[PDB]
Coordinates of N, CA and C and ligand atoms in Angstrom, one line a residue:
X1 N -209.0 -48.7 -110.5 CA -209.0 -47.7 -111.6 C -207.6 -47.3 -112.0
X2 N -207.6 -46.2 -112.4 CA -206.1 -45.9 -113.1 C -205.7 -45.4 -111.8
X3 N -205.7 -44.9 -111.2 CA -204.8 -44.6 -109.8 C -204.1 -46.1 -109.2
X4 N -205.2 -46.7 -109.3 CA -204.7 -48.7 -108.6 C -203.8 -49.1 -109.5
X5 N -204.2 -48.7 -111.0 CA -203.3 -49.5 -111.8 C -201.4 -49.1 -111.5
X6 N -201.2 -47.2 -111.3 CA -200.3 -46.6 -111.3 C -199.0 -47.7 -109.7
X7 N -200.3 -47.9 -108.9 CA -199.5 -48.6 -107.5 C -199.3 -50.4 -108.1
X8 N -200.0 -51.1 -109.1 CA -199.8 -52.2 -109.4 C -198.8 -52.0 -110.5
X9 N -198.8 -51.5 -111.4 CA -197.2 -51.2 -112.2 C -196.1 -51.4 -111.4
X10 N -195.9 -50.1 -110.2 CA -195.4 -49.5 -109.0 C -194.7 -51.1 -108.7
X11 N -195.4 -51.7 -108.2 CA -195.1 -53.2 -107.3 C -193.8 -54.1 -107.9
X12 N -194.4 -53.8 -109.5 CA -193.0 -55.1 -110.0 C -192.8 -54.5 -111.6
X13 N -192.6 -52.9 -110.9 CA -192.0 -52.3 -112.4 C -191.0 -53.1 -113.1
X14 N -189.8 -53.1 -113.2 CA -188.9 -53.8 -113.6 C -189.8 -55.1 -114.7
X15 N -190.7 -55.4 -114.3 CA -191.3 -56.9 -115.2 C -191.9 -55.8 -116.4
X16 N -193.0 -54.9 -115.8 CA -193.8 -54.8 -116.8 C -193.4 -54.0 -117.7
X17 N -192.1 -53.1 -117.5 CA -191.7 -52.2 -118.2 C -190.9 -52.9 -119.3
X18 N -190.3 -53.9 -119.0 CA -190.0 -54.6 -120.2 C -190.3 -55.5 -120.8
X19 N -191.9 -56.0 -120.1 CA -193.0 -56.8 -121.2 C -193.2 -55.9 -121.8
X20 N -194.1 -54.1 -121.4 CA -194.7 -53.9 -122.3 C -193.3 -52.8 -123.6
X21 N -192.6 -52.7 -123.1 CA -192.1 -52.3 -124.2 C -191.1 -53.1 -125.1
X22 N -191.1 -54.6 -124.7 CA -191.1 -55.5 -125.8 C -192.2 -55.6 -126.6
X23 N -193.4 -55.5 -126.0 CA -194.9 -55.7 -126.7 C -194.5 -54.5 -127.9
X24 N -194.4 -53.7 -127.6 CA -194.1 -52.7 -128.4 C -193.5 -52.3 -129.4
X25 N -191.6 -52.9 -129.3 CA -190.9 -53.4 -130.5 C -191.1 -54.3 -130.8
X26 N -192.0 -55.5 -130.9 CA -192.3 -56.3 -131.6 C -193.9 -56.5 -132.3
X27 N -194.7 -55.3 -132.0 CA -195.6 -55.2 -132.7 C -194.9 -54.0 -133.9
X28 N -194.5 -53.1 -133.4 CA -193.9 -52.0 -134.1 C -192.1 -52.6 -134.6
X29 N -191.8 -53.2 -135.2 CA -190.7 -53.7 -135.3 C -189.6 -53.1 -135.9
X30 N -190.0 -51.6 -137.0 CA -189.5 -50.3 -137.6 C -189.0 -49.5 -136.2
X31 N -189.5 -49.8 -135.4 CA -189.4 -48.8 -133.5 C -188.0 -49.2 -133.5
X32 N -187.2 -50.4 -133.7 CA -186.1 -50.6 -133.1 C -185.3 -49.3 -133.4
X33 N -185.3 -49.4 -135.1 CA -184.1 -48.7 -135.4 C -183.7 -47.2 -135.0
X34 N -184.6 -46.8 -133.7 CA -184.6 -45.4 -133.4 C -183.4 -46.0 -132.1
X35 N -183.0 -46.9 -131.9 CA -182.1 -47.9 -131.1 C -180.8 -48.2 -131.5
X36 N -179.8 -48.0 -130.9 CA -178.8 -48.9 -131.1 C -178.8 -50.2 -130.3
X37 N -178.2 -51.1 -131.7 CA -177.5 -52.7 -130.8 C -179.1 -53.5 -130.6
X38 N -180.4 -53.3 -131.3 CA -181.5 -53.8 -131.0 C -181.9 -54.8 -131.8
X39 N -181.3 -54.6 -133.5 CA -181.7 -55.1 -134.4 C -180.7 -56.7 -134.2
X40 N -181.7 -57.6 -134.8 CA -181.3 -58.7 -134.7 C -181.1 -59.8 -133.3
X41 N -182.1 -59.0 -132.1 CA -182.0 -59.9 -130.9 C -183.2 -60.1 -130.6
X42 N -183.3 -61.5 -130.0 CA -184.7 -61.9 -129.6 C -185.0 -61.2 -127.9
X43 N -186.2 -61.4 -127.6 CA -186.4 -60.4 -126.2 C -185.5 -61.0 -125.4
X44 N -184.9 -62.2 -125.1 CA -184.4 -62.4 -123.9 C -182.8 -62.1 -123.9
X45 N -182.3 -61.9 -125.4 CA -180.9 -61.2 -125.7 C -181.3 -59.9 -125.0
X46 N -182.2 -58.9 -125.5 CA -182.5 -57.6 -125.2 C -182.6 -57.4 -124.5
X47 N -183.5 -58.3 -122.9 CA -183.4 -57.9 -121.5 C -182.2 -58.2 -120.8
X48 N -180.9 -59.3 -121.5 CA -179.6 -58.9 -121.1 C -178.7 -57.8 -121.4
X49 N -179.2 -57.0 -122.1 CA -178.4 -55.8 -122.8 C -178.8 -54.5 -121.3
X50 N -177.3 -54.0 -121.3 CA -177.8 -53.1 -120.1 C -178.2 -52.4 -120.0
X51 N -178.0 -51.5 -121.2 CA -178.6 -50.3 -122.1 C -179.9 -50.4 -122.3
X52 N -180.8 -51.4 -122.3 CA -182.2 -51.5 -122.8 C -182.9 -51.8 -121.4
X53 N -182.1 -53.0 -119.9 CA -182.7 -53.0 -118.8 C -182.8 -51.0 -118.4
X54 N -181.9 -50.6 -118.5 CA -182.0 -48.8 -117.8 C -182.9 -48.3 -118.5
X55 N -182.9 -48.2 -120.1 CA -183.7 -47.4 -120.4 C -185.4 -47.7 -119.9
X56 N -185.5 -48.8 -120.3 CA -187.0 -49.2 -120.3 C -187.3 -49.2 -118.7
X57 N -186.3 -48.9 -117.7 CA -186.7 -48.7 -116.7 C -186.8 -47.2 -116.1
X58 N -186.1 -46.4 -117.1 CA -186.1 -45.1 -116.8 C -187.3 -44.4 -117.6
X59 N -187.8 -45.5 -118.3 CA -189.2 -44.8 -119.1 C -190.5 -44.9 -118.0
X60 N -190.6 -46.0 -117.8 CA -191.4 -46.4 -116.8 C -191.9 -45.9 -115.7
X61 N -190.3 -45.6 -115.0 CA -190.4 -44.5 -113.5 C -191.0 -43.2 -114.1
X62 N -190.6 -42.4 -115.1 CA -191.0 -41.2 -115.6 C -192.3 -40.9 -116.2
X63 N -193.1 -42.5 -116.6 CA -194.2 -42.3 -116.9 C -195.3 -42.5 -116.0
X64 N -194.9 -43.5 -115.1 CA -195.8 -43.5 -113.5 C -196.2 -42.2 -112.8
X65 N -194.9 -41.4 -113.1 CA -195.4 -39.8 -112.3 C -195.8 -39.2 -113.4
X66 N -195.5 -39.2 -114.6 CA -196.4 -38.1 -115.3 C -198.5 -38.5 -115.4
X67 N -198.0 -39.9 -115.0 CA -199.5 -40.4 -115.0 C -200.3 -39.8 -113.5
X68 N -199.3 -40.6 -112.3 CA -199.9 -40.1 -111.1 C -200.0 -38.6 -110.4
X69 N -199.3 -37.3 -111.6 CA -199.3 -36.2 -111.6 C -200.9 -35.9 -112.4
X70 N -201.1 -36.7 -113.0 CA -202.6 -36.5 -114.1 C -203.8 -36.3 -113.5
X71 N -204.7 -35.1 -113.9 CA -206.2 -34.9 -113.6 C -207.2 -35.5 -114.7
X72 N -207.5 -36.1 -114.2 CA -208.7 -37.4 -115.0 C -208.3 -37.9 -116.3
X73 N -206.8 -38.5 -115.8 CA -206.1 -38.7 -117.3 C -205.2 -37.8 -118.3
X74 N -205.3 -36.2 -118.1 CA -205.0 -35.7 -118.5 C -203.6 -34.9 -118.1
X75 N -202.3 -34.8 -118.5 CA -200.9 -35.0 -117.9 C -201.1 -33.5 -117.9
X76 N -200.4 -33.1 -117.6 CA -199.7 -31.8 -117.0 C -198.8 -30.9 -118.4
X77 N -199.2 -29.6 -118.2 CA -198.4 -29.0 -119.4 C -196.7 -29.2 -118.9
X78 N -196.3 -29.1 -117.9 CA -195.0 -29.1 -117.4 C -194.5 -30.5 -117.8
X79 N -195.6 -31.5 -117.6 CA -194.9 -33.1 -117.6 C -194.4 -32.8 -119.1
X80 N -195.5 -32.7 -120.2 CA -195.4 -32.8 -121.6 C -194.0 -31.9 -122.4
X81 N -193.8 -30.5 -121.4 CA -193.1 -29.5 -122.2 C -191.4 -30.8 -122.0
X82 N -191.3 -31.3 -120.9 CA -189.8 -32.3 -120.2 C -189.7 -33.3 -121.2
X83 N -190.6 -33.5 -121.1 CA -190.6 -34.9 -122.8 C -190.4 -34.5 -124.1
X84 N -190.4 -33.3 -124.0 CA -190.3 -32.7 -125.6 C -188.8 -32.1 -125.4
X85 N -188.5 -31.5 -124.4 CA -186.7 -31.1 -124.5 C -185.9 -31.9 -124.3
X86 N -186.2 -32.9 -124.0 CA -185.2 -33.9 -124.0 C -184.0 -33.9 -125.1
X87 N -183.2 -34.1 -124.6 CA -182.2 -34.3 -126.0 C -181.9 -35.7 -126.7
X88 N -182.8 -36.5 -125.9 CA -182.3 -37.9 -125.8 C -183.7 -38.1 -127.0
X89 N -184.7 -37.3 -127.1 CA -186.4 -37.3 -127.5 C -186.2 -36.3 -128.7
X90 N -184.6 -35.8 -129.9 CA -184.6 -35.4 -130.5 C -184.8 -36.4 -131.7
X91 N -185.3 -35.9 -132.8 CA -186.0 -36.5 -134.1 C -186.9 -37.8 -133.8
X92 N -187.9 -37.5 -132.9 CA -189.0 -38.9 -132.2 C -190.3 -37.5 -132.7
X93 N -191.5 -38.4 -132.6 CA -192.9 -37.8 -133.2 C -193.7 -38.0 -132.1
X94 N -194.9 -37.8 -132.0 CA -196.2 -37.9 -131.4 C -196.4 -39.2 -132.1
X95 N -196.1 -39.8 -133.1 CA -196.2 -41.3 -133.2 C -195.8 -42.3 -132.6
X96 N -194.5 -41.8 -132.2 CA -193.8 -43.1 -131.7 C -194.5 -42.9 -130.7
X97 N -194.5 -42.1 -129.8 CA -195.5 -42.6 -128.0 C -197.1 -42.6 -128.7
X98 N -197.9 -42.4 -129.7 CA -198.9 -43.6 -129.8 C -198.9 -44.5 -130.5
X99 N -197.7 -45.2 -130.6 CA -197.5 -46.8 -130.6 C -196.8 -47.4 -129.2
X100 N -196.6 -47.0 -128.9 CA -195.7 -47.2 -127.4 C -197.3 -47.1 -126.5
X101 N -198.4 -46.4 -126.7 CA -199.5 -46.7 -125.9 C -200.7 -47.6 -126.5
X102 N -200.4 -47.8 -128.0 CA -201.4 -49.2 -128.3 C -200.6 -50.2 -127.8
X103 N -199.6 -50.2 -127.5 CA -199.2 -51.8 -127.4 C -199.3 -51.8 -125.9
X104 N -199.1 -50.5 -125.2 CA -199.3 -50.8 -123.9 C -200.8 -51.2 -123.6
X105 N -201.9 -50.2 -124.3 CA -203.2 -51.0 -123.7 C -203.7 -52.0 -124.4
X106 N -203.4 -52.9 -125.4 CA -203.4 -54.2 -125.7 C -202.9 -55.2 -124.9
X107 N -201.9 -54.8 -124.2 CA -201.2 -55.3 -123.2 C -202.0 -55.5 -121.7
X108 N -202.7 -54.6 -121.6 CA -203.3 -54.8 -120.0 C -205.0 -55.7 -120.3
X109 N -205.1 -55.3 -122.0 CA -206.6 -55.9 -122.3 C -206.0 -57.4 -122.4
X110 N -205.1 -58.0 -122.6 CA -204.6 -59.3 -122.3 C -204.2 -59.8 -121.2
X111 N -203.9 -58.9 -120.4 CA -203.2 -59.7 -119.3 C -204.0 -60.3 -118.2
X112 N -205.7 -60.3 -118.2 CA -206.5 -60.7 -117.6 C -206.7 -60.1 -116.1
X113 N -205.8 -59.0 -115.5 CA -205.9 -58.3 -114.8 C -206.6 -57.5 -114.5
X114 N -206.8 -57.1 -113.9 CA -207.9 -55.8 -113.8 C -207.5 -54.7 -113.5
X115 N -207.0 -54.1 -115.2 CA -206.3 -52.8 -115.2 C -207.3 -52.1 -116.0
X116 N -207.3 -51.0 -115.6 CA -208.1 -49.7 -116.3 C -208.1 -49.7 -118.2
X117 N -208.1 -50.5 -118.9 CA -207.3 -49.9 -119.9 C -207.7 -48.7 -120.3
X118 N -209.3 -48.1 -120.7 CA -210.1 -47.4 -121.3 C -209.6 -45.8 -120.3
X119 N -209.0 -45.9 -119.2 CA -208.3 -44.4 -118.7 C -206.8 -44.7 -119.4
X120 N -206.5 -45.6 -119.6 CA -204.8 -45.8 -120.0 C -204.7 -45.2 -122.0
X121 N -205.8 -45.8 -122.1 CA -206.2 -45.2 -123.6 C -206.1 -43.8 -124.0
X122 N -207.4 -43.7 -123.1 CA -207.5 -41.9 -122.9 C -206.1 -41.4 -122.4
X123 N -205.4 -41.3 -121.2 CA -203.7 -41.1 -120.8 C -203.1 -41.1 -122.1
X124 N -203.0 -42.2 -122.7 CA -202.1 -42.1 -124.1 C -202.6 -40.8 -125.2
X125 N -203.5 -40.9 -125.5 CA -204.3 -39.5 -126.7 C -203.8 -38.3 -125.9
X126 N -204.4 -37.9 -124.7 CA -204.0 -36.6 -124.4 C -202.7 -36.2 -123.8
X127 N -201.8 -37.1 -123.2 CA -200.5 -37.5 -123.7 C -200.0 -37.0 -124.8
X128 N -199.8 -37.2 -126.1 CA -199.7 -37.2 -127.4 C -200.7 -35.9 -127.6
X129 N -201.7 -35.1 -127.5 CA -202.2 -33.6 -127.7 C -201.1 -32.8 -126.6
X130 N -200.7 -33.5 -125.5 CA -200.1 -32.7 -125.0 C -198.6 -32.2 -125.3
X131 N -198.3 -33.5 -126.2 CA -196.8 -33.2 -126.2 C -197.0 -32.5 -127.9
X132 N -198.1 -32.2 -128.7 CA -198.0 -31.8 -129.9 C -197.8 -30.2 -129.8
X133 N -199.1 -29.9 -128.5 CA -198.8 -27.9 -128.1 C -197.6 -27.7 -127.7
X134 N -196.8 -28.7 -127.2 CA -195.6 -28.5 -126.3 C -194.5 -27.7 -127.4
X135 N -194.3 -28.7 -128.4 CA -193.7 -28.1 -129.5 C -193.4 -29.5 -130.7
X136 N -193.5 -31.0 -129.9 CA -193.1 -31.8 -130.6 C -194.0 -32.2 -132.0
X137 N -193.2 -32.7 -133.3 CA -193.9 -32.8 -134.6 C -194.8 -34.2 -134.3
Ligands
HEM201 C1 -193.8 -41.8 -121.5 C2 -193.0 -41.9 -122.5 C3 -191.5 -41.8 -122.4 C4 -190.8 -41.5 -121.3 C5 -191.3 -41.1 -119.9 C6 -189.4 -41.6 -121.6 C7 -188.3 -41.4 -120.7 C8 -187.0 -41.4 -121.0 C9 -185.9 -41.0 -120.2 C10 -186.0 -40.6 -118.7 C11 -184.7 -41.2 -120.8 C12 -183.3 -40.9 -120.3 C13 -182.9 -41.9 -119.3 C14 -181.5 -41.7 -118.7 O1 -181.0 -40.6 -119.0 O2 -181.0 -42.6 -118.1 C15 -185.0 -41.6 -122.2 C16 -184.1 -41.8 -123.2 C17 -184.5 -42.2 -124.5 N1 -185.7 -42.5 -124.9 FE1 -187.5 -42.1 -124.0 N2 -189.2 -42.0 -122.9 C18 -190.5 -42.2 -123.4 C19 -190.8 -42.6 -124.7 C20 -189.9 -42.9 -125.7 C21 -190.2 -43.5 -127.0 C22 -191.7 -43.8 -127.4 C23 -189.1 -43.7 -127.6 C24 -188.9 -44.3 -129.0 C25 -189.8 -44.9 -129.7 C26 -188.0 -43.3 -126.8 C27 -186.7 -43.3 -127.1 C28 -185.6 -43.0 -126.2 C29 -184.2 -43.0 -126.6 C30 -183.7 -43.4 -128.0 C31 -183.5 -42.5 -125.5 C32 -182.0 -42.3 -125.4 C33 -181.2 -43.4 -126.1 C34 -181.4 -44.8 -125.4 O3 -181.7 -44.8 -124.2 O4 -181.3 -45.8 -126.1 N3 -188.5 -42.8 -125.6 N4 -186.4 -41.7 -122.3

């Protein structure tokens, strides 16, 4: 279930964090330009860029614990208020992270695994309610 999935992420973060947030900017392809240095590279330019291996790895670690901090899916007011002060998370929406979680659970309904998507879904929506009370537009 979604607790298994949190320790199978866990195992070989580094891969999936930047399958799925390739999956991501390239379903959402407008997402780059909230990026520098993105536009005009195919994924395998982009996972040599060192700036895009850190980030998409520092998303990843940050989202495993806001997940594995979660009661039945549902994140924590403290996880959501940290995502919203960010200064790095200034002029971003409650849209961009639900496009960042359709492509993530399209991504686990493909991968033939046996990942939770249907709690990863749910994670994502109240996610996004939570970061709306927080204060984000
Ligand atoms: C669960 C969702 C997310 C988490 C946990 C997260 C986490 C983080 C963290 C920890 C940093 C700073 C890393 C460091 O200081 O080394 C960061 C920076 C950043 N994040 Fe997020 N992030 C999330 C979603 C997003 C989304 C959806 C976008 C854009 C669509 C985004 C765009 C950025 C940008 C632009 C920066 C700084 C500039 C850059 O790294 O290129 N983040 N994020």
């Amino acid at each position: 279930g979604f607790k298994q999935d949190i320790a199978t992420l866990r195992g070989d973060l580094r891969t999936y964090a930047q399958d799925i947030f390739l999956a991501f900017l390239n379903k959402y392809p407008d997402e780059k330009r909230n990026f520098k240095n993105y536009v005009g590279k195919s994924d395998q330019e982009l996972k040599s860029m060192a700036k895009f291996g850190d980030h998409t790895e520092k998303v990843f670690n940050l989202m495993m614990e806001v997940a594995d901090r979660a009661t039945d899916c549902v994140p924590l007011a403290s996880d959501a208020s940290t995502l919203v002060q960010m200064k790095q998370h200034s002029g971003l929406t409650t849209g961009n992270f639900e496009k960042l979680f359709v492509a993530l659970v399209e991504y686990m309904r493909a991968s033939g695994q046996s990942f939770d998507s249907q709690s990863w879904d749910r994670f994502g929506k109240n996610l996004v309610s939570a970061l709306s009370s927080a204060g984000m537009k």
